Amino acid sequence: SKKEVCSVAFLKAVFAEFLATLIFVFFGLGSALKWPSALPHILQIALAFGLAIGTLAQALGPVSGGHINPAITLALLVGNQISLLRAFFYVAAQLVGAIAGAGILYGVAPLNARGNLAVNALNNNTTQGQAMVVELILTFQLALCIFASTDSRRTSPVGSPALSIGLSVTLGHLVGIYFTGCSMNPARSFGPAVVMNRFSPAHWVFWVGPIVGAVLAAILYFYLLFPNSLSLSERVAIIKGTYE
Amino acid sequence: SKKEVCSVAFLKAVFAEFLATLIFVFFGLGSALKWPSALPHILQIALAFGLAIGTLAQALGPVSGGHINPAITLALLVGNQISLLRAFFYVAAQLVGAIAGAGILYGVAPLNARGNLAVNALNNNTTQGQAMVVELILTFQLALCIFASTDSRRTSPVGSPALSIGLSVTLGHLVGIYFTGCSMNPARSFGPAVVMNRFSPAHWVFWVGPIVGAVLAAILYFYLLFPNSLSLSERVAIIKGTYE
Amino acid sequence: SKKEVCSVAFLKAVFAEFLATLIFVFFGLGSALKWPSALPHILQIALAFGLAIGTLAQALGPVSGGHINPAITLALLVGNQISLLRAFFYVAAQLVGAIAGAGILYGVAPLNARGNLAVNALNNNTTQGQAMVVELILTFQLALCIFASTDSRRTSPVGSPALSIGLSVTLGHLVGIYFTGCSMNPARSFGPAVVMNRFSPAHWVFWVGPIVGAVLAAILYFYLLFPNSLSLSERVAIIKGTYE
Amino acid sequence: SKKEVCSVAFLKAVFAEFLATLIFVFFGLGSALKWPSALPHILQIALAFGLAIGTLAQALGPVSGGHINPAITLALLVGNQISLLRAFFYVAAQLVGAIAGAGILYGVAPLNARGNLAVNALNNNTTQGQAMVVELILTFQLALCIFASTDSRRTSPVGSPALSIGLSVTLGHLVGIYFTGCSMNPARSFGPAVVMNRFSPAHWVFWVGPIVGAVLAAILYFYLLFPNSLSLSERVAIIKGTYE
Ligand code: NI
């Protein structure tokens, strides 16, 4: 719907998705660099990734929904929450933002700590198929947490949606870092991979794992656990971007 | 009650308790595996067990109550909050879930990190009886925090029920790892024990300790501190699953 | 007031303070013991002292107020919030709870980990006067947090009072552990000193500092920053325990 | 507006800014001192700086706004939220408070921990230009978090504004400590520099960085993302402290 697409609100929602992924990728990779004076602990990395998401969802969430992740965007598309063009523009803004975020870190990081710019890397003792099942589970819990925390029909105390979602990213890293350095986000993986021109043969896992994981969470959440009562034409209106 | 059991909503609750226990033990055991490149810190593990519950309570709490622990479900039955059949199906789903969680983790962990699959284990310098009193206290504070945070009659600012409950699991880990590897949940102990075919002689401590501790918190909470004005006919109807 | 002190609600409040200080001291000390398998990091101890208070304030706070500290009790008394008899019984229940918690820990901790049972020891390079001004600042920030977070006239979003209060205890340990092992609570120091029967020549700092620190926060909060429109008779009615 | 300044409410607000900055700087620098018994880990320092802000915004926020940072005060001025004289008196009190807080720490810290009193220090492999871009980004995300969390127009669950803001400070520290020891606040840097009469050649970075970074966040938030429908005349009444 070009009337939804050519709006001021839509322009600033696409911009917020660009800026949030820029910041997220900046803080995340910068925390996991191989700083020689003190090599970062898994705890430090899990916390920086989680607190960045938690802060950006709190600050830019009222502007665009604060997806900051192509897997979550595509899951919301599948789960009939956003339009087709919102998904296209958000994903492209997230990928552009991740590249810019990694590029800014590349420019300010000193040579002795920059290394491979914290690109995701599959553990030598784990296979692509093994790692793919892990990324699916890391992203599934994250998406499920997001959908329950942002659902307007929830009546029980929601607490802090932003911090709940943020600490779900921290949780994902406390296991995921051992398998693939933890991605949960195709853009977070693509970002440094473009700046360093370093795409491993396992790069596909970092896209498929999170997308399948979030899509399975959206199917379970929006269609099996808490479905809404919308007519066939109301569901296509949401895809087209002309709903209410 | 055949009306309570043969309900689509009860089937969703049983599946959610299965799914959340599956995801819980996956992350919990996954975080405490003896990873060669970096041996998990105590703070790291305590935070992973705590945030896994914190996330699952936020996500699947609306579906089933977010029990995820046979000891909490038994305390809720003895505290007259749930039916006998709900308690029965819940414990079953949690046990099967814990097994399924440990097995998925088994299929993905690399050989050099698998080890015991994070089974609970008494400290060599502590006795079975000493472990039991520790497990009772660890699970007593967790159940108290749950009962207080989910009480519909609470007029005090509750904050985040999921994060308080989750950080109460982190608290019990900061003390209980040194004694038994921290259980506070019979399903967390049974899960890896079944998958690895490894049961310690102190395995009973991992069932009795948390169950006694949670039941003592239910009697103190629901019968001594904050009782309801309920008649014999209403109390019996809660057990039979026929109440309102 | 015989009408207030002989009541069932008052009996439950005193018990809650004993039980909360029992659990707080058991968790607090048990996290700081010199465990041979892995000596607890400062961040492990700050988080365990902080999460125990946060969890206990959430669980038992609606029963008694979740004082769990003699210094906070006396600050609420001077600030004209609680009665003189309420303060005496709270302080006595807190002192006995701290002794009981320490004793339960003593009989459960193994011989090689038990040691001095996490008693407050002053740093060999800081004078008693330096440690007292530090304990003044430590408890002052905590008390101000408790007052602002539990004021019923507060219109600003309070978030989670329990977690804010508990994370304040964590902050206090990140500075205070270095100076005195961190007290901010006379009963926390009293507890293990009575079980181990070992009182330092600076134990008075652990009473003077916290009390004076909480007291100055009560004078500043309740009389300078946000005073109430209460007549002199209403003030004595509060101390006597006859007010509303 | 001399009547805005000559008000008991303004007297309490300026005192709160002073006291909050005194406490923030004492706790922050104290957590980063080179304590020989155990040298502080990055995770300890980041948490202490963050939890001091979270705690102080929770307690003194209702009194003055809980700015505690000259870059945030100046950013709110540009964003048309505070008067010119409120900005003047807040900044003045923050610098005075930072010096007092650093000076109090000097008076209580043992000689083996004192060192440089945890002043900011440029990493030798980072240029003043690189570290300036870092300080910009660190403070930019913190300001956006504050503006989105304190906006009275927010319809989405804010959760805990204080904890969200505080954990954004921890987040900034998880990256910035490697570049500059993390400033994000001109008063934080000014305090121990004045007390130790030690001003490195890159002290300007710890002013320009945070100020520009927070000012860009204030321009983006109040003028581009969420502008108010006010008239130029009402806008100058805000600058002059006469509006509502
Ligand atoms: Ni460490």
Distance from CA of A150 to the nearest CA of B (A): 10
Which chain A residues touch D143 with a CB distance below 8 Å?
none
Q: Which residue of B has its CA nearest to D163?
A: B159
Nearest-5° Cα angle at A51, A49 to A52: 65
Q: Which one, of D167, D215, D163, D210, lies nearest residue D186 by Cα? A: D210
Which tokens sit at C173? Answer: 């340990």
D73 close to D37: Cβ distance less than 8 angstroms: no
Q: Which residue of B has its CA nearest to D161?
A: B159
Reduced to 3 states, what is the DSSP secondary structure of residue A152?
coil
Which tokens sit at B19? Answer: 């799914």
Residue D36 CA to residue D112 CA, distance in Å, equals 7
Sign of CA dihedral A221, A223, A226, A230: positive
Residue C139 CA to residue D16 CA, distance in Å, equals 17
Task: Give the residue from B21, B51, B154 with the most A CB atoms within 10 Å of its CB, the best one to mutate.
Answer: B51
Contact partners, residue D147, CB within 8 Å, separation at least 6? A59, D79, D217, D218, D221, D222
Instruction: Judge: C156–D61 Cβ closer than 8 Å, yes or no.
Output: yes
Which chain D residues touch A35 with a CB distance below 8 Å?
178
D15 close to D65: Cβ distance less than 8 angstroms: no
Spell out the domain ranges in chain C: 2-240
Question: Tokens 């980990």 belong to which residue?
Answer: C113
As a CATH number, domain B2-240 is: 1.20.1080.10
- Amino acid at residue number C69: N
Q: Which of B145, B154, B179 sits opposite C55 (nearest CB)?
A: B145
Residue B81 CA to residue B90 CA, distance in Å, equals 14
Residue D59 CA to residue D51 CA, distance in Å, equals 12
Backbone φ, ψ for residue D73 (5° rounding) = -60, -50
Distance from CA of C129 to the nearest CA of D (A): 9
C25 close to B141: Cβ distance less than 8 angstroms: no
A112 close to A36: Cβ distance less than 8 angstroms: yes
Task: Give the residue from A140, A144, A147 with the most B CB atoms within 10 Å of its CB, the best one to mutate.
Answer: A144
Listed resolution, Å: 2.2
Q: Phi-psi bin for A68: left (phi > 0), alpha (psi -120 to 50), beta? A: left
Contact partners, residue C14, CB within 8 Å, separation at least 6? C64, C89, C90, C93
Length of chain D in residues, anyone? 244
Report in angstroms the alpha-carbon separations of C203 from B58, C21, C101.
44, 19, 19
Q: How many CA atoms lie within 13 A of D81 on its CB side?
A: 22
User: Which chain D residues in 152-181 lie under 8 Å from chain B, judged by CB atoms?
Assistant: 159-160
Report chain D's C-alpha Rg in angstroms: 18
Which tokens sit at D105? Answer: 């720490």
Report in angstroms the alpha-carbon separations of C33 from A137, B178, C186, D36.
37, 10, 19, 20
Report in angstroms the alpha-carbon separations of A106 from A51, A100, A119, A189.
21, 10, 12, 15
Report in angstroms the alpha-carbon separations of C76 from C14, C214, C240.
16, 9, 14
Distance C138 CA to ligand 1 centre (A): 25
Residue C85 CA to residue B224 CA, distance in Å, equals 23
Which chain A residues touch D168 with a CB distance below 8 Å?
51, 55
Tell how many helices (H) and how many strands (E) occur in chain A. 11, 0
**Max Cα separation, chain C?**
60
The verdict on C7 touching A (C-beta cutoff 8 Å) is no
Distance D181 CA to ligand 1 centre (A): 19
The DSSP secondary-structure symbol of D225 reads I
Residue A216 CA to residue B239 CA, distance in Å, equals 35
Terminal-residue alpha carbon distance, chain C: 12
Which chain B residues touch A168 with a CB distance below 8 Å?
51, 55
Residue D89 CA to residue D80 CA, distance in Å, equals 16
Report in angstroms the alpha-carbon separations of B163 from B116, C78, C159, D160, D194.
29, 34, 12, 12, 41
Question: Tokens 């440089």 belong to which residue?
Answer: D116
Chain centroid to Cα A63, Å, comes to 16
Nearest-5° Cα angle at D73, D67 to D78: 145
A133 close to A210: Cβ distance less than 8 angstroms: no
Distance B242 CA to ligand 1 centre (A): 53
Q: Which one, of B25, B91, B89, lies nearest residue B53 by Cα? A: B25
A64 close to A90: Cβ distance less than 8 angstroms: yes
Residue A169 CA to residue A183 CA, distance in Å, equals 10
Residue C226 CA to residue A51 CA, distance in Å, equals 34
Residue D73 CA to residue D94 CA, distance in Å, equals 10
The verdict on A129 touching C (C-beta cutoff 8 Å) is no
Query: How many CB atoms sit inside 10 A of residue C156's CB?
Result: 16
Experimental method of this PDB entry: X-ray
D191 close to D31: Cβ distance less than 8 angstroms: no
The verdict on D116 touching A (C-beta cutoff 8 Å) is no
Residue A70 CA to residue A75 CA, distance in Å, equals 8
Sign of CA dihedral D184, D188, D193, D196: negative
Where chain D is discontinuous (C–N > 2.5 Å), the residues before each break are: none
- Burial call D191-210: b when 16+ CB within 10 Å, e when fewer: bbbbbbeeebebbebbbebb
Task: Give the residue from C45, C58, C151 with the most B CB atoms within 10 Å of its CB, the best one to mutate.
Answer: C58
Which tokens sit at D137? Answer: 């980004």
Q: Which one, of D101, D124, D97, D105, lies nearest residue D35 by Cα? A: D105
Q: Which residue of C has its CA nearest to A161?
A: C159
Distance C187 CA to ligand 1 centre (A): 30
A149 close to A165: Cβ distance less than 8 angstroms: yes
Q: What is the dihedral of CA B6, B10, B12, B18, to 10 degrees?
A: -110
Sign of CA dihedral C97, C103, C105, C107: negative
**Max Cα separation, chain A?**
60
B172 close to B184: Cβ distance less than 8 angstroms: yes
Q: How many CA atoms lie within 13 A of A143 on its CB side?
A: 33
Sign of CA dihedral C178, C179, C184, C188: positive
DSSP alpha helix (H) spans, C65-204: 70-78, 84-106, 111-114, 128-150, 161-180, 186-196
Q: Which residue of C has its CA nearest to B164?
A: C55
Backbone φ, ψ for residue B128 (5° rounding) = -60, -45
Chain centroid to Cα D128, Å, comes to 21
The verdict on D195 touching C (C-beta cutoff 8 Å) is no
